[PDB]
Design an enzyme around this catalytic site. Structure first.
Site, PDB file in Angstrom:
ATOM      1  N   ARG A 175      -1.485   2.097 -11.716  1.00 55.97           N
ATOM      2  CA  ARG A 175      -1.096   3.467 -12.016  1.00 55.97           C
ATOM      3  C   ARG A 175      -0.498   3.626 -13.404  1.00 55.97           C
ATOM      4  O   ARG A 175      -0.461   4.749 -13.917  1.00 55.97           O
ATOM      5  CB  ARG A 175      -0.110   3.967 -10.963  1.00 55.97           C
ATOM      6  N   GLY A 219       5.288   7.656  -1.512  1.00 60.23           N
ATOM      7  CA  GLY A 219       5.140   6.639  -0.493  1.00 60.23           C
ATOM      8  C   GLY A 219       6.022   6.941   0.696  1.00 60.23           C
ATOM      9  O   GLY A 219       7.044   7.620   0.583  1.00 60.23           O
ATOM     10  N   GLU A 236       0.825  -1.207   0.000  1.00 59.61           N
ATOM     11  CA  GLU A 236       0.000   0.000   0.000  1.00 59.61           C
ATOM     12  C   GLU A 236       0.862   1.261   0.000  1.00 59.61           C
ATOM     13  O   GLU A 236       0.744   2.131   0.862  1.00 59.61           O
ATOM     14  CB  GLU A 236      -0.965   0.000   1.186  1.00 59.61           C
ATOM     15  N   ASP A 237       1.751   1.333  -0.990  1.00 62.84           N
ATOM     16  CA  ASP A 237       2.635   2.465  -1.258  1.00 62.84           C
ATOM     17  C   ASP A 237       3.726   2.649  -0.215  1.00 62.84           C
ATOM     18  O   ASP A 237       4.436   3.655  -0.256  1.00 62.84           O
ATOM     19  CB  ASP A 237       1.861   3.776  -1.404  1.00 62.84           C
ATOM     20  N   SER A 238       3.887   1.721   0.716  1.00 64.71           N
ATOM     21  CA  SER A 238       5.031   1.795   1.606  1.00 64.71           C
ATOM     22  C   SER A 238       6.303   1.411   0.858  1.00 64.71           C
ATOM     23  O   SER A 238       6.267   0.848  -0.238  1.00 64.71           O
ATOM     24  CB  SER A 238       4.835   0.889   2.817  1.00 64.71           C
TER      25      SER A 238
END
Ligand SMILES: [Zn+2]
Ligand SMILES: [Zn+2]
Ligand SMILES: [Zn+2]
Ligand SMILES: [Zn+2]
Lengths: 69, 10, 1176, 116
Positions: free
Chosen positions: C972, C940, C788-790
DNA sequence: TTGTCATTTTGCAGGTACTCTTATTCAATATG
RNA sequence: CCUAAGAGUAC
DNA sequence: CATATTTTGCAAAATGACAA
């Protein structure tokens, strides 16, 4: 600002290879890749460490010192 | 209308 | 090369672009507009009006003194000096920007004007006309009328002619571009304000409910006059099915919409045939005649010019004019108020009648479905007010105020018969304070946000701020006309999406020129004057417009346009002038006003030698430009102005861009007609009639979007995200950051120029002042801590300096004169004789109350010690004696911040009172929660950090600096991210620089071939081993260098918690903000969620115990809180009810008590009762 | 309709009934100029307008570089090169039929098929 | 002893949280 | 301290 | 010399007649 002492990823010392790199670029008219290979930077981590450095410290040195002795 | 976009009317 | 006239290639155009940026620069529009304002507009403002005449009549009770006098004051030339500063001791000396910034001064220069005073005398003989003569008392003598702030690097600034060495000496960064003001030591930039163009006729349809179907309007305005907006509207009453289709005009200062034929007859055109000739230019166009017959039928009642003038005067809203002077009033309305942009003098009735006929013609054409209604979003109909026009109108208002004050003073001193002095007359404070207030605050008056604090977070951020345009408020959409003038993808995501725009790299704004030479050229070359124009004898005549003023007609528009183009291409006409020829509409429009946005383009000519269309620019010009650039880094200089003056390149704005055909690239579109499958699909347009050629398509982008590598391989919202997010990137904003006392500064330890770089980013100095680092990135689902974009950052890499930063913060403190001898003093406060001393330690302060540089400071520690005098001889608080004559006004360090004090600067302000600035330096090291992003909108935060031994490693021992999740890629569609990683890998291996320019012929297949030639897998995959066990990973990992920015959002500046703290004084609720130790808002819809959960007691605890619980007493007779409760004496009494044994106490929020008391103060009784009077 | 104006005072002429000859008679409203009527038509209302689609054609329309070129047959010169453009009537229900102007003869011919 | 129909005036409010910075507090003439 | 304005973060 | 005051979306409610 000034050349980093060590490559960020692997940790090879590259802070002593900046003046040699500039001398190879200028005096010998070598292209960047051959000069990097000559100094012993074989992994592209070290190659990007030395190749992409911007020596801003020269600009900082242009201004007169604030505290001059 | 609305408001916005009174009523109509009022 | 060897051939001088050989055609250029797509690579050669970059030489042209280099020349352009060698002459223009990045902020050329700001400096050009300000130079235009200073050089010419100030003199025009001074000379126009500003001739104060006061006629003191004889008032002769006796004929012995029947002499009438007339005092006149005139303003001559205006002199603007170099910037200088006054002082407390009165010594005036030259002021430099890197002194005003430190001392909180204003970089302004004084203004002087040659004031000439004359007096006339006449004999007051009744009946005889007065004749005034000089008395030979001609006194003239410059006077100081104020100070104009000067933007940096402008023609009147000290840095305009400075060399690089001089800039270094003056503590000025050579990379600094200027174009901003210094107001009270703060850098202010004027955002270009967008508006609709004036003197253009626009026709709009109207909705069904409205009775008027179409409205034609013009926002008439004159530049060289009162500069007032008068809106003339021509409205067509009646829907499509209606029969009474009468056209009516809305004249200013008239309460009703006058029929058009009445206006024509008032102007002096009585016969119906002449009116229809003035309106309709085609006899065969019987549809327009049929649609227009209701107007003449309506106006048949008036058959005389005087009758029409009387009609207009009767409709006049003044209603204070006698019947015979109504004619004069109407004449004044039709002379000085009707279409002012045409003329203000008399004798030009025919011109205004022709213009009205043209407006009605446009309205009828739109109503007849012959032309679409005008698009309000067409960028050629918009103007950008830069610093020049904004300062011009503000100074016009301010100088009008000053001259009215001068006249009032003169009247007062002549009625009181006192002596007259120039110094007592002028009040330079008016101009000075007005300009300083308008620039210091956002508001522009006496609009908001016109002037904004210049953004200095990063060099690209500063550049983008200096080229920003704002539209006061679908207007948010990206219009077609925006091509090449504003950045297609650079706009805020919030409420300002589309309203705030950024100029393209090569887009400029016209500064405006005088149209008189062009009018003279038109008259010389055969333009028929409009006064003696009869449409019947010249049916196919092209109407010629100059700045929206119909000046006449031409019978041979082709030759006229050709010679105008030749004159503009040799420099005889200013190149900013835009000339448009609409063949279908038979119109010729010339625009010279300021605010028009244009861009340069190559010129394509017939080139009969090659037998086909070709660019005017050849290899010889490219060679000369290259020679000039090499000499700059002895032959004749060849600059961009040389290309402009020899007809090689042209300036085209949107209006002229409507009537041209542009070739995207020369090498593929100019010459007439086994392809690489890896290359993208392009078409040749199958057409050879080009008039211009794009210098380079990549110049449609703005400053922020020119940093994106391969922006054409990205989804457009990703490009917008990167454009908005690179302004928050951390780097080196200026080279002289060590001598600037900015409020906040962030600097990378080791900025690196990107491995993947664009051709346009070496004009933005991005390779000299980079704002990111090349991190070895692996795209892998390694540990699940990058979901999750970490991201997973290498801890060992951080230890060696990756993304490490310096952070400077400056605190400013002044001593202020509270009175004649109530001056504040910087000192170390002593607990013996000081009040309100903070809990922070004062130990680090030495005698002068300023921490010496080098001392470590932690949160809440006092860094500036200041005390103010107070009234003595007061005893209270338990420990307040007469010795406490000083109140502490110290400045502590931020509660959440700490570091080493870097520098402190002591000086004197404008008033001469000592003030100080303390800059404190700390180091920000990346940690869990800091925000990083690539150049493709892949933001992120750091999820976790692993040491080197735990990271996956290749067979060569290379470990990634970053690990990002694969799942960020497919949705994306940031293909440019992968392509740039591959290109950066190849560039690092080969030692070259990756050319990541958008519209080049660089394909993934070629990069992969180079990578395979280097001995790696062609698609960038590498066999990696698990760090924990050393076993091979079953899946190969995408691995390589990628450029990342460290964003300004660090977790340590956002973490906040509050158990109990300061409360608001009014509502007794927690204060707002983490800087004030505030509380979080438990908003309405959080309460709704808790209601949905059914937890009533938790909601009550949140709203009462957590925020504000107040015990208040009421009585059972009246529910009001008017109960006097002496708790210690145990006495409760409600006066009025006269009860003492019927009192209750309730627990309600203090906000509820305040609401009830406010309702009581508003004559409402919210009686609170503790028992039910009615059954459910 | 072809409206006509009085030649005495340059004003409009309105239709008028006649009794002696029972004929349409055009009359002036301010100078009593009276004359015969060229045509019985006194009012035309085009619910569907066919004209105006070729409007804007000029003797040098070929000088416009934005107008697309074509090599379609010119049925007056048999020339290839010409300019073409769609209907100029900006109504939403107009057809997409193209019009062609030959740059050597200035004859406008359409690409329609029902008309041909 | 009842319908009629046809112009002219009538009120407005825009999501939830959160961070930061900057400016400014009526100027000036007039009387005590 | 209040007010206003501007910039920005996540939706 | 210092404090005091001079862009947006309509359906009705109301109006002026009115007509024998
Ligand atoms: Zn390395
Ligand atoms: Zn009571
Ligand atoms: Zn007549
Ligand atoms: Zn032909």
């Amino acid at each position: 600002m000034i050349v980093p002492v060590r490559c960020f990823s692997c940790g090879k010392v590259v802070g002593d290879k900046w003046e040699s790199y500039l001398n190879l670029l200028q005096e010998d008219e070598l292209d960047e890749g051959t000069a990097l290979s000559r100094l012993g930077l074989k992994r592209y981590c070290c190659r990007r460490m030395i190749l992409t450095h911007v020596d801003l410290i020269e600009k900082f040195l242009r201004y007169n010192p604030l505290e001059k002795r | 209308t609305x408001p916005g976009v009174t009523x109509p009317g009022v | 090369f060897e051939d001088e006239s050989a055609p250029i290639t797509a690579e050669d155009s970059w030489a042209v672009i280099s020349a352009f940026f060698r002459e223009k620069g990045l902020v050329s529009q700001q400096l050009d507009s300000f130079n235009q304002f200073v050089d010419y507009t100030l003199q025009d403002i001074i000379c126009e009006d500003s001739t104060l005449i006061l006629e003191q009549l004889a008032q002769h009770t006796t004929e012995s003194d029947n002499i009438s006098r007339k005092y006149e004051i005139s303003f001559g030339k205006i002199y603007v000096t170099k910037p200088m500063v006054n002082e407390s001791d009165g010594v005036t000396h030259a002021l430099y920007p890197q002194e005003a910034r430190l001392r909180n001064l204003t970089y302004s220069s004084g203004l002087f004007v040659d004031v000439k005073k004359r007096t006339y005398e006449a004999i007051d003989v009744p009946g005889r006309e007065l004749k005034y003569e000089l008395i030979a008392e001609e006194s003239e003598g410059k006077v100081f009328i104020g100070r104009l702030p000067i933007m940096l690097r402008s023609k009147n600034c000290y840095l305009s002619e400075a060399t690089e060495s001089d800039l270094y000496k003056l503590k000025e960064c050579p990379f600094d571009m200027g174009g901003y003001f210094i107001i009270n030591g703060s850098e202010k930039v004027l955002i270009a304000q967008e508006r609709s163009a004036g003197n253009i006729v626009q026709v709009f349809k109207k909705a069904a409910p409205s009775p008027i179907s179409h409205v034609a309007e013009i926002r008439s305005a004159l530049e060289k006059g009162s500069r007032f907006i008068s809106t003339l509207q021509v409205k067509l009453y009646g829907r499509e099915g209606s029969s009474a289709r009468t056209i009516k005009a809305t004249l200013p200062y008239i309460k009703q919409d006058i029929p058009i034929v009445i206006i024509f007859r008032a102007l002096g055109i009585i016969p119906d045939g002449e009116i229809l000739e003035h309106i309709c230019y085609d006899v065969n166009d019987w549809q327009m005649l049929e649609m227009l017959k209701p107007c003449v039928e309506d106006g048949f009642v008036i058959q005389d010019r005087e009758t029409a003038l009387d009609f207009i005067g009767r409709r006049g809203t003044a209603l204070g004019i006698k019947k015979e002077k109504r004619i004069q009033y109407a004449k004044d309305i039709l002379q000085k108020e009707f279409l002012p942009h045409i003329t203000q003098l008399e004798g030009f009735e025919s011109r205004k009648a022709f213009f009205l006929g043209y407006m009605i013609n446009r309205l009828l054409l739109c109503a007849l479905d012959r032309k679409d209604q005008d698009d309000r979003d067409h960028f050629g109909k918009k103007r950008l007010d830069l610093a020049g026009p904004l300062l011009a109108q503000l100074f016009k208002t301010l100088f009008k105020k000053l001259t009215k004050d001068i006249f009032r003073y003169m009247q007062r001193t002549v009625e009181e018969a006192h002596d007259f002095n120039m110094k007592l007359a002028i009040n330079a404070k008016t101009i000075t304070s007005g300009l300083k207030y308008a620039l210091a605050t956002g508001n522009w008056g006496e609009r908001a946000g016109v002037s904004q604090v210049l953004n200095r977070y990063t060099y690209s951020s500063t550049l983008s701020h200096l080229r920003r345009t704002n539209t006061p408020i679908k207007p948010r959409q990206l219009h077609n006309t925006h091509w090449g003038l504003v950045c297609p993808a650079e706009t805020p995501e919030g409420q300002a999406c589309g309203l705030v725009k950024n100029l393209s790299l090569m887009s400029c704004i016209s500064v405006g020129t005088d149209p008189m030479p062009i009018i003279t050229f038109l008259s010389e070359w055969g333009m028929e004057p409009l006064e003696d124009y009869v449409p019947h004898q010249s049916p196919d005549a092209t109407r010629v417009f100059v700045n929206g003023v119909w000046h006449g007609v031409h019978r041979n528009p082709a030759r006229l346009m050709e010679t105008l183009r030749t004159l503009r291409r040799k420099g005889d006409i200013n190149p900013e002038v835009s000339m448009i020829r609409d063949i279908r509409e038979k119109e010729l429009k010339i625009f010279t006003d300021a605010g028009r946005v244009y861009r340069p383009l190559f010129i394509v000519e017939d080139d009969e030698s090659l037998g086909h269309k070709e660019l005017k620019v050849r290899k010889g010009h490219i060679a000369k430009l290259m020679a000039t650039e090499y000499q700059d880094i002895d032959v004749e200089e060849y600059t961009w102005s040389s290309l402009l003056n020899e007809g090689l390149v042209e300036y085209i704005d949107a209006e002229e861009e409507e009537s041209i055909l542009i070739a995207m690239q020369p090498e593929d579109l100019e010459p007439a007609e086994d392809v690489d499958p890896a290359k993208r699909i392009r078409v040749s347009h199958h057409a050879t009639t080009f008039t211009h050629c794009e210098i380079h398509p990549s110049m449609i982008l703005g400053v922020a979007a020119s940093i994106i590598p391969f922006p054409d391989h990205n989804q457009s919202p990703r490009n917008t995200y990167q454009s908005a997010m690179g302004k928050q990137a951390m780097g080196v904003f200026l080279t002289n950051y060590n001598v600037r006392m900015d409020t906040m500064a962030n600097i990378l330890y080791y900025p690196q120029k990107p491995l993947g770089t664009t051709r346009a980013m070496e004009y933005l100095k991005f390779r000299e002042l980079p704002a990111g680092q090349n991190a070895i990135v692996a795209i892998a689902c390694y540990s699940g801590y990058n979901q999750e974009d970490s991201m997973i950052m290498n801890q060992s890499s951080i230890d060696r300096g990756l993304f490490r930063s310096l952070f400077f913060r400056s605190y400013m403190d002044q001593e202020k004169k509270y009175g004649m001898s109530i001056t504040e003093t910087f000192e170390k406060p002593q607990r013996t004789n000081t009040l309100r001393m903070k809990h922070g330690t004062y130990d680090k302060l030495d005698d002068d109350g300023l921490i010496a540089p080098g001392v470590r400071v932690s949160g809440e520690d006092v860094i500036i010690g200041k005390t103010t005098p107070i009234s003595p001889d007061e005893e209270e608080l338990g420990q307040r004696t007469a010795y406490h004559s000083k109140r502490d006004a110290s400045t502590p360090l931020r509660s959440t911040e700490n570091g080493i004090v870097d520098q402190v600067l002591v000086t004197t302000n404008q008033d001469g009172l000592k003030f100080v600035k303390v800059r404190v330096r700390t180091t920000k090291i990346p940690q869990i929660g800091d925000k990083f992003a690539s150049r493709h909108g892949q933001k992120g935060t750091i999820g976790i950090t692993y040491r080197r031994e735990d990271m996956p490693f290749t067979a060569e021992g290379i470990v990634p600096d970053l690990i990002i999740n694969p799942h960020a890629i497919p949705s994306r569609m940031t293909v440019a991210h992968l392509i740039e990683c591959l290109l950066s890998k190849v560039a690092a291996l080969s030692g070259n620089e990756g050319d990541a320019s958008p519209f080049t012929d660089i394909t993934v297949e070629g990069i992969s071939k180079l990578l395979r030639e280097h001995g790696y897998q062609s698609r960038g995959f590498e066999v990696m081993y698990n760090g924990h066990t050393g076993k091979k990973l079953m899946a190969q990992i995408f691995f390589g260098p990628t450029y990342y920015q460290r964003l300004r959002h660090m977790v340590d500046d956002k973490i906040h918690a509050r158990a109990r703290g300061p409360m608001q004084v009014l509502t007794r609720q927690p204060v707002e903000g983490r800087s004030r130790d505030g509380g979080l808002r438990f908003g309405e819809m959080e309460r709704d969620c808790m209601i949905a959960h059914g937890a009533a007691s938790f909601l009550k605890e949140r709203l009462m115990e957590a925020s504000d619980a107040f015990r208040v007493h009421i009585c059972g007779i009246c529910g009001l809180m008017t109960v006097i409760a002496k708790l210690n004496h145990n006495q409760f009494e409600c006066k009025g009810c006269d009860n003492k044994i019927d009192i209750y106490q309730i627990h309600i929020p203090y906000a509820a008590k305040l609401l009830f008391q406010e309702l009581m103060a508003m004559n409402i009784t919210p009686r609170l009762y503790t028992d039910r009077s009615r059954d459910f | 309709t072809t409206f006509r104006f009085c030649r005495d005072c340059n004003n409009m002429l309105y239709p008028r009934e006649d009794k002696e000859n029972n004929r349409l008679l055009f009359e002036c409203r301010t100078c009593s100029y009276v004359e015969e009527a060229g045509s019985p038509l006194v009012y035309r209302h085009e619910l569907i307008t066919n004209i105006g689609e070729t409007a804007g054609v000029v003797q040098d329309i070929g000088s416009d570089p934005t107008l697309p070129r074509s090599d379609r047959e010119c049925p007056k010169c048999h020339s290839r090169e010409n300019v073409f453009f769609q209907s100029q009537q900006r109504r939403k229900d107009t057809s997409m039929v193209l019009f062609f102007v030959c740059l050597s003869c200035s004859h406008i011919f359409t690409s329609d098929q029902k008309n041909k």
